[PDB]
Design a protein around this ligand. Structure first.
Ligand SMILES: *[C@H]1O[C@H](CO)[C@@H](O[C@H]2O[C@H](CO)[C@@H](O[C@@H]3O[C@H](CO[C@@H]4O[C@H](CO)[C@@H](O)[C@H](O)[C@@H]4O)[C@@H](O[C@H]4O[C@H](CO)[C@@H](O[C@@H]5O[C@H](CO)[C@@H](O)[C@H](O)[C@@H]5O)[C@H](O)[C@@H]4O)[C@H](O)[C@@H]3O)[C@H](O)[C@H]2NC(C)=O)[C@H](O)[C@H]1NC(C)=O
Ligand SMILES: *[C@H]1O[C@H](CO)[C@@H](O[C@H]2O[C@H](CO)[C@@H](O[C@@H]3O[C@H](CO[C@@H]4O[C@H](CO)[C@@H](O)[C@H](O)[C@@H]4O)[C@@H](O[C@H]4O[C@H](CO)[C@@H](O[C@@H]5O[C@H](CO)[C@@H](O)[C@H](O)[C@@H]5O)[C@H](O)[C@@H]4O)[C@H](O)[C@@H]3O)[C@H](O)[C@H]2NC(C)=O)[C@H](O)[C@H]1NC(C)=O
Ligand SMILES: *[C@@H]1O[C@H](CO[C@@H]2O[C@@H](C)[C@@H](O)[C@@H](O)[C@@H]2O)[C@@H](O[C@@H]2O[C@H](CO)[C@@H](O[C@H]3O[C@H](CO)[C@@H](O[C@@H]4O[C@H](CO)[C@@H](O)[C@H](O)[C@@H]4O)[C@H](O)[C@@H]3O)[C@H](O)[C@H]2NC(C)=O)[C@H](O)[C@H]1NC(C)=O
Ligand SMILES: *[C@@H]1O[C@H](CO[C@@H]2O[C@@H](C)[C@@H](O)[C@@H](O)[C@@H]2O)[C@@H](O[C@@H]2O[C@H](CO)[C@@H](O[C@H]3O[C@H](CO)[C@@H](O[C@@H]4O[C@H](CO)[C@@H](O)[C@H](O)[C@@H]4O)[C@H](O)[C@@H]3O)[C@H](O)[C@H]2NC(C)=O)[C@H](O)[C@H]1NC(C)=O
Ligand SMILES: [Cl-]
Ligand SMILES: [Cl-]
Ligand SMILES: [Cl-]
Ligand SMILES: [Cl-]
Lengths: 407, 407
């Protein structure tokens, strides 16, 4: 009765949204449920710090050399670009299956070889551009201002939007890019001004607050009344990037409530299924008990790794029946591509290239007086269509107007 | 009486100038001479194919895991960028000393950490820019056309010249870049024309023949008589990049002889010391006997690795005396930096950052009738000065004129 041995390579520093501490709960939650459809086997999981860098490769390597050539049966992570690339190169070499909710970089989509043993469970950066482009086709838009902060680290926002940018170029849409890092004082006044003289549609990606601030300034300039379309992206369904919460409890709450009436927050497709609440509460509990309290406990990564466990099992089961073993990594990976199944937060489809299709929701303020938010549209990556949710009540408000770039 | 174990990671494909077959002779030649100043120890060298890519990391890793955690005492190579980066990352991790005649990329000069255990024995791409810049200061030039072919592989030429470019930008020199790949038909006619309407000084990097061809076209346009300064770079002192040999034995020999009177070939500092002839003949012999006959047997890489062996020994000796062992890689590397010694092809100085200083020569035709080439200038990286060789007889010829960019 032998066991499946998995190596989980994630950051030790809880400052990352995909740190071992905030991710492990979810991985274990999936292990529990999966254990009750393999034969009659158990799991053995090792959590190593990737340091979101070279450490990841090091562990995997030392681990193997120190275990007299014994390589794991499944590798989860790394997430970071330069941390995941080498590990994935090794996985392909040692015919191991590597599943990550990271490896978002666009280079990771060329699996003609060194990356043939990788499948990305989370939507890659490129998927935001595909979504945005469909939105503009629906709204008949063709120009836009891309505003984003810049890490000079992971540059999550920089890549998300530059991805969008890069897509619009090929399709002929004209854009205006505005970069800046929130680590420094915000000369947002300068930005908001340039924007009002540049485009009618703005797509932003930055901290929850940097977004709220940009809105107050554009509100001060009365651009918040319907002649401007504002979009902030909640990267990896993390509150830290702005989920549309205009309230704070300060001098500007009312001012902010009104401003947000023109803001549309793009998030991962909305779910409310109970299973997801049980999941959320439990993960919160775990990270709670272990001293750490802020942020949200469920983000794109946390949900991704839970779903990566399920995907592995489904694949394994199908490989066994074919006569192969948990040791034929490529065979497992192949079985992992072009497949759909239900995750804790909704459907999860992997395209024929082993990359997750991106499903998104668009949340807008539908009751300006109340400040009540509500999803009004969804983008399904598989079918590649954007669709406005039927029977959403919006009797009056700035979203009733038709933006126009003839200015 | 224990032995030093070295891993040599180089390409298997002899199409590379630094392939295991063309490099090994030189490494062995250095091993022989070194063996007669360590104690009373011998060497043990393993030659693994790097595939000029991921293979390098793989071997090093499998090799170690398969030898129950036994890591070599010295790693030679890889040369290729993406092949050497990971190996060097591991070296730093396993406190191993890595010496390469490659790792020419500019990122490899930041040894604040992941690259702290690397020392580059060959002059890095950046060194060409430092040399060229000094030449222009001496010639009082300030504008130039950078012509180079483009691999879309290693892009040796692309990087050499873009390095020069990148340096001129910071120093305020204006440039014109002309890219093209010799894999396709050469529309050189278009180039030569643009150039004559652009600058008076041209710096090229491309195959021996692509250079000879560019010269015949510029000669056909009579730009070869002294109003234009032509420079081709003999990358890694390899004939394949043009060493100034205008003769071929075709219809155009005479035409070419005249054209080359305006060409100045930049090579690695010239040597004629006997030891270097013995070295050259022997390496030629080895690669000869082993079925392979073209190209030249001594290039920057071949000489580099011979010199890397000597540098290791010098360092080791100094580490022992300090009370450390062949196992303190960093200690050895440190002892390898900021050091000068005589190699088989002349002095070799390593700067305080562990990078070789570039010493170059400039060969020009000093007897236009005869077609006789001769070095007329040298650039010493350490002192960073360009100097024209005294008492070189040039009574008449296009090199007697003073180029002028007032056109
Ligand atoms: C990524 O990010 C986006 C943006 O945030 C997500 O958007 C959604 O976020 C959550 C996901 O479920 C939704 O909120 C949840 O909705 C539950 C149902 O609410 C009903 O709707 C009305 C609306 O007026 C509400 O007032 C009423 O309560 C309805 O039931 C609801 O569940 C939560 O309930 C408690 C609130 O803290 C709490 O206790 C639980 O109670 C239930 C009731 O039996 C049980 O499950 C159990 O007993 C629990 O104890 C618990 O926290 C529950 O979660 C809450 O309203 C809950 O917040 C958002 O509506 C939705 N966002 C919007 C604006 O549409 C995406 O879903 C996400 N996507 C991905 C891919 O991750
Ligand atoms: C990288 O690339 C550049 C560009 O090519 C190099 O430039 C130099 O290249 C070589 C390096 O040594 C030089 O050529 C060698 O010079 C030897 C001395 O020649 C003398 O000068 C006159 C010039 O008119 C010459 O006619 C006369 O012969 C003088 O002796 C000479 O040695 C070679 O001799 C034989 C030729 O094939 C051959 O046999 C040997 O004979 C000698 C004699 O006793 C002994 O060593 C032994 O018996 C051998 O059997 C052997 O091949 C010898 O090498 C040849 O002229 C030889 O080619 C170039 O002059 C010089 N280039 C120029 C134009 O200046 C750089 O040096 C190089 N740098 C680096 C860092 O690698
Ligand atoms: C990738 O997966 C799909 C399977 O579909 C998906 O997977 C399921 C589990 C769910 O996730 C779904 O959401 C997805 O649909 C494979 O792709 C191709 O699937 C199509 C059908 O989806 C299949 O088509 C064959 O059959 C059609 C008929 O449907 C034939 O085409 C025409 O049919 C009409 C009549 O319907 C005739 O009048 C025409 O003459 C013509 O025949 C034809 O026979 C198709 O071959 C298709 O074969 C299949 N593969 C292809 C060709 O891309 C992939 O195989 C999976 N992996 C990949 C992409 O390689
Ligand atoms: C890097 O190596 C050099 C050593 O020099 C090199 O190595 C030798 C083996 C050969 O390869 C040579 O080609 C090279 O020269 C170290 O760099 C610095 O070296 C200098 C001298 O080269 C040294 O200077 C100290 O001494 C000077 C006097 O020479 C003092 O400076 C002034 O001196 C005048 C009188 O001469 C006084 O009137 C002034 O008041 C003033 O004192 C001063 O004391 C200098 O410290 C220097 O100390 C040394 N290191 C420094 C400071 O960079 C490096 O140590 C090696 N590694 C590195 C770069 O860290
Ligand atoms: Cl990571
Ligand atoms: Cl480490
Ligand atoms: Cl290599
Ligand atoms: Cl391989």
């Amino acid at each position: 009765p032998q066991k499946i041995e998995v190596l989980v390579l994630l950051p030790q520093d809880d400052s990352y949204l995909f740190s071992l501490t905030r991710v492990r709960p979810a991985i274990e939650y999936a292990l529990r449920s999966v254990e009750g459809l393999p034969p009659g086997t158990r799991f053995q999981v090792a959590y190593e710090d990737s340091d979101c860098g070279n450490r990841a490769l090091f562990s995997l390597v030392d681990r193997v050399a120190a275990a007299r050539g014994a390589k794991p049966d499944l590798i989860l992570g790394p997430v970071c670009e330069y941390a995941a690339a080498p590990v994935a190169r090794l996985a392909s070499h040692w015919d191991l299956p590597m599943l990550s909710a990271g490896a978002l970089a666009a280079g990771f989509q060329h699996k003609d070889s060194e990356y043939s043993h990788l499948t990305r469970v989370a939507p890659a950066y490129a998927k935001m551009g595909e979504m945005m482009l469909a939105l503009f086709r629906h709204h008949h838009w063709s120009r836009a201002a891309l505003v984003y902060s810049d890490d000079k680290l992971e540059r999550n926002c920089y890549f998300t939007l530059e991805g969008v940018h890069e897509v619009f170029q090929e399709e002929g849409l004209h854009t205006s890019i505005y970069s800046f890092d929130e680590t420094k004082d915000l000369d947002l006044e300068d930005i908001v001004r340039n924007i009002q003289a540049s485009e009618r549609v703005v797509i932003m990606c930055a901290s929850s607050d940097t977004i709220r601030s940009i809105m107050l300034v554009a509100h001060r300039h009365g651009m918040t009344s319907g002649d401007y379309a504002f979009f902030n992206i909640e990267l990896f369904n993390s509150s830290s990037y702005g989920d549309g919460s205009w309230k704070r409890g300060d001098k500007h709450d009312f001012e902010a409530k009104q401003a947000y009436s023109s803001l549309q927050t793009v998030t991962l497709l909305r779910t409310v299924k109970p299973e997801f609440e049980k999941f959320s509460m439990e993960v919160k509990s775990s990270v709670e008990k272990q001293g750490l309290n802020m942020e949200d406990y469920v983000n794109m990564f946390v949900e991704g790794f839970h779903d990566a466990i399920l995907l592995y099992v489904l694949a394994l089961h199908e490989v066994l029946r074919a006569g192969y073993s948990k040791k034929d990594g490529g065979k497992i990976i192949q079985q992992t591509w072009n497949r759909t199944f239900e995750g804790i937060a909704g459907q999860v489809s992997i395209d024929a290239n082993g990359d997750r299709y991106g499903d998104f929701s668009v949340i807008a303020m539908t009751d300006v007086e109340a400040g009540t938010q509500e999803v009004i549209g969804d983008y399904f990556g598989k079918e590649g269509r954007f669709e406005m949710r039927p029977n959403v009540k919006y009797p009056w408000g700035p979203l009733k107007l038709r933006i126009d770039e003839n200015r």
